[PDB]
Amino acid sequence: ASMEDLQAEARAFLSEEMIAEFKAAFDMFDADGGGDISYKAVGTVFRMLGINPSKEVLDYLKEKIDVDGSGTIDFEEFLVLMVYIMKQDA
């Protein structure tokens, strides 16, 4: 599914308890301090919440760092990444 499709699916596939939980590690790692964290920081979010991402996904944030320079990712992007992570999880 395309990321645009994942946007809509994210809140429907995931639970409210889930999106609120992922936000916990996200909001504490606020780089811009408004709805955005660093791409390098988001990788740690998974580790703190006990989530194991995929090597291709981990590479996905890193490549974005080089394109954005600042290195910031939105909550939507962050939370949308979780969709496929959970689909392949367990």
Q: CA 41, CA 45: separation in Å to the nearest integer?
A: 7
∠ CA 3-89-83, nearest 5°, is 20
Helix residue spans in the chain (DSSP H): 3-13, 16-28, 39-49, 55-68, 75-88
Solved with: NMR
Q: Do residues 70 and 37 make contact, with C-beta atoms less than 8 angstroms apart?
A: no
Question: Helix, strand, or coil here: 75?
Answer: helix
Which of 61, 59, 21 lies closest to 41 in space, CA to CA? 61
Please, which residues bridge with residue 74 across strands?
A: 36
User: What architecture is the 3-88 domain classified under in CATH?
Assistant: Orthogonal Bundle (1.10)
> What are the sequence ranges of the domains in the chain?
3-88
Angle at 79 between CA 22 and CA 19, to 5 degrees: 45
- 21 vs 25: CA distance, rounded Å: 7
Contact partners, residue 85, CB within 8 Å, separation at least 6: 46, 51, 53, 54, 57
Q: Three-state SS for 14?
A: coil
Nearest residue to 79 via CA among 2, 1, 3: 3
Phi, psi of 72 (to 5 degrees): -105, 140
Beta strand pairing call for 72-74 and 36-38: antiparallel
Residue 61, Cβ density class (10 Å: 0-12 exposed, 13-18 middle, ≥19 buried): buried
